[PDB]
């Protein structure tokens, strides 16, 4: 049970087709900076980490990304979800040379290093659910928040 992690209403958002990888990270990190969950330059360190250590997961049907940085830049535990209209290509976390067309981003900000695998385990459980991920593509910001908040509180 991934406990002790914050999740507010403004943490869910939709992004247009014109956005790139770095625009998505900046957009998903903006609510975290305002609430004081991460440092002011949190988005910058997430971009640099993504270039060296990709977080794209080519899961069927909907591709997933888990962009993040070190626990050094996280003040409080939090997660922000980002949905895309058109698929944006993230690099493979497994190291394979094929691209991962991501439509759903789970930006993780975790202060405790020892709690990382709990979050990953929780993400891996959610993304395997084919019915749930299909709903996230159609659901609006208010509908996504209620679905994730219920899943998170277990």
């Amino acid at each position, epitope marked *: 049970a991934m406990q*002790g992690i914050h999740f507010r209403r403004h943490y869910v958002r939709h992004l247009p087709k014109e956005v790139s990888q770095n625009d998505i990270i900046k957009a998903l990190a903006s609510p975290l900076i305002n609430d004081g969950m991460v440092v002011s330059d949190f988005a910058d360190h997430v971009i640099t980490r993504e270039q060296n250590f990709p977080t794209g997961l080519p899961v069927e049907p909907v591709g997933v990304a888990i962009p993040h940085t070190d626990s050094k830049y996280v003040r409080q535990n939090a997660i922000s979800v980002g949905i895309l209209a058109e698929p944006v290509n993230f690099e493979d976390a*497994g190291g394979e040379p094929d691209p991962v067309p991501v439509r759903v981003v789970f930006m993780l900000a975790l202060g405790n*290093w*020892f709690d990382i695998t709990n979050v990953l385990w929780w993400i891996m459980d959610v993304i395997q659910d084919e019915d749930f991920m299909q709903q996230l593509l159609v659901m609006n910001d208010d509908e996504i928040y209620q679905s994730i908040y219920t899943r998170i509180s277990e």
Partner: antibody
Amino acid sequence: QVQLVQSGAEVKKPGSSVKVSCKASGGTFSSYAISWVRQAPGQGLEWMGGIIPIFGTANYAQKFQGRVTITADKSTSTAYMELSSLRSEDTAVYYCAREGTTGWGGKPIGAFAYWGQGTLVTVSS
Amino acid sequence: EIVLTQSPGTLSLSPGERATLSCRASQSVSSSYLAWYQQKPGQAPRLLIYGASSRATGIPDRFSGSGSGTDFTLTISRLEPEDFAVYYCQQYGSSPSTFGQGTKVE
């Protein structure tokens, strides 16, 4: 079960570096945290650092920050630890450890359920 | 940063008696990030308790962890000759993780 087979003991001189390996098997490799714990003769345990192989997120303690490098090869399910600038203080048994999981065969717990046999590194000249 | 000070340093009991080992923290550690280990001579540490109270697989009922915040306790209720070992407490609520100095039960 989960097994962690470490490399053999080594005898290095002061100044040189040492690289100990930790071959993991039995469970999933990438999705769980691998830690490195040290124990000098009759001294007790100290956490050097660790790594989660999936995203290569290595973490270090401030004391060994700089002279310690922990990596994980996903293609061979092996974790490594390279301690540089070796001194007499570094003479200890080096353990690699992996976090357990809740229930039988489960969500990760954090605490080190599985440990390697240990690698005795001795520093002298 | 967070130092764990265990007590007693050494203990000697008879088989069947209860053994109350303590582990005090310098700062408030969350209950979900506290674990106890058993280390016999020549062997690696065996995980007994994790998350303050939760007991690892294969560990019998006589071992029981309890505590919150600063004060933490490991209770070994019915001592067996096999329980003669050094016992460490660990915090993993933040980096760097730190262990206690250890308690030798004889």
